[PDB]
Amino acid sequence: GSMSLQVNLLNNTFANPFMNAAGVMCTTTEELVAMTESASGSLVSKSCTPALREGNPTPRYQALPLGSINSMGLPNNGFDFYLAYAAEQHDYGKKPLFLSMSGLSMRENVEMCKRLAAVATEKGVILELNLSCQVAYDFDAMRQCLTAVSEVYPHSFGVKMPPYFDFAHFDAAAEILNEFPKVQFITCINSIGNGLVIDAETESVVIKPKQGFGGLGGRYVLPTALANINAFYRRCPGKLIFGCGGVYTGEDAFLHVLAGASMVQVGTALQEEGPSIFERLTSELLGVMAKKRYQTLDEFRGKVRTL
């Protein structure tokens, strides 16, 4: 049986659906290069602000048996850096590039988008707009953010969404997203926000910022991620869903795709394993498909059976 993890979307061809989750292993040149050199089908740069940010005091990330918790504080090299990477450095012959943007205000997103436009046009970098860096838990702030970006940014882009936890919210968020035809992918999900990990041995939290509260990733978040992927897969039929959350194995990735994911992003697992993980994941996902007699992702994407 001939098989393929190839994905075609956004006027690009991807060798496989895998890419890093924004913020994981994608902050520095070396990381971006490592992601480019990896087996991943794509990569996305660390969510950027107009200027570099040191981020939060450490420890600000902690790997856990069931995932991770982090309150990084948006450390990044600043927009110029990621723009320059996209404009001059990235080898688009190897794989497409997503640039994650997380302006701390509408104005910042507008100004970065205005500059990104030309690089997107010339080089084909694709914006993933981080709406979940809060913003998308305020549907008005979300609408305004998307409106502003859509107004100034003359390309399709995607949005990185925080998880929602009820249909009213799935419906409200989809309704808004569907109002913006430039939003051509939706990445579900960012962390499950503000969990609190307590180490029983130390009787303390495990990250320093925010009294130990931080975003959960990893095994914790898989059913929430699947819920969100599928929810928006159903509710935004005009749009692609990128899955993100709880992917450690080809099998997990298979679940993302069944739920409706086109690309599958890997955060916590990648953080722990390094970009070699993509060789394992592609292999595993092919293995899963082989055992299940699938040849292409199209054959089961979004086809999760309900009862």
Ligand X SMILES: Cc1cc2nc3c(=O)[nH]c(=O)nc-3n(C[C@H](O)[C@H](O)[C@H](O)COP(=O)(O)O)c2cc1C
Ligand Y SMILES: O=C(O)c1[nH]c(=O)[nH]c(=O)c1[N+](=O)[O-]
Report the catalytic residues: 133
Options 106-114, 188-196, 227-235, 272-280: segment touching ligand X (CB under 6 A): 188-196
Task: Identify the residue whose tokens are 């990185």.
Answer: 160
The item of its own copies, ligand Y, ligand X, none sharing an interface with residue 218, based on CB under 5 to 8 Å by kind, is ligand X
The item of ligand Y, its own copies, ligand X, none sharing an interface with residue 2, based on CB under 5 to 8 Å by kind, is none
DSSP-assigned letters across all residues of 232-272: HHHH-TTSEEEEESS--SHHHHHHHHHHTEEEEEE-HHHHH
Q: Is 73 annotated as a binding residue?
A: yes
* Structure tokens given for 282: 């592609």
The item of its own copies, ligand Y, ligand X, none sharing an interface with residue 83, based on CB under 5 to 8 Å by kind, is none
Options 79-87, 88-96, 132-140, 148-156: segment touching its own copies (CB under 8 A): 132-140
The item of ligand X, its own copies, ligand Y, none sharing an interface with residue 266, based on CB under 5 to 8 Å by kind, is ligand X
Measured from the CB atom, is 146 or 188 closer to its own copies?
A: 188
* Structure tokens given for 17: 């659906």
* Structure tokens given for 39: 């087996």
Decide: is 99 part of the binding site for ligand X (CB under 6 A).
no
Q: How many CB atoms lie within 10 A of CB 269?
A: 24
- The residues in 266-295 that bind its own copies, with binding defined as CB under 8 A, are 288, 292
Whether the Cβ atoms of residue 133 and residue 108 lie closer than 8 Å to each other: no
Give bridge partners of residue 70 from the DSSP assignment.
61, 215
Measured from the CB atom, is 30 or 306 closer to its own copies?
A: 306
CB of 186 to ligand Y, least distance (A): 14
What whole-number distance in Å separates Cα of residue 193 and Cα of residue 163? 8
Distances (CA, A) of 204 to 140, 196, 208, 218, 287: 36, 10, 10, 21, 41
Measured from the CB atom, is 3 or 52 closer to ligand X?
A: 52
Q: Pick from 95, 160, 239, 256: which binds ligand X (CB under 6 A)?
A: 160
CA 277 to chain centre: 16
Q: Pick from 10, 15, 19, 22: which binds ligand X (CB under 6 A)?
A: 22
Residue 152 neighbours by CB under 8 Å, 6+ apart: 110, 113, 114, 117
291, burial (CB in 10 Å: exposed 0-12, middle 13-18, buried 19+): exposed
Q: Pick from 134, 144, 276, 283: which binds its own copies (CB under 8 A)?
A: 134
Q: Is 22 annotated as a binding residue?
A: yes
Answer whether the bond into residue 181 is a cis peptide, omega within 30°: no
Residues binding its own copies (CB under 8 A): 59, 66, 69, 134, 137-138, 162-170, 192-198, 200, 202-208, 210-213, 216, 219-220, 223-224, 226-227, 230-231, 234, 251, 254-255, 258-259, 288, 292, 300, 303-307
Residues binding ligand X (CB under 6 A): 21-24, 46-47, 61, 68, 70, 72, 100, 102, 130, 160, 189-191, 217-218, 221, 244-247, 266-269, 271
Residue set of the binding site for fumarate: 46, 73-74, 130, 190
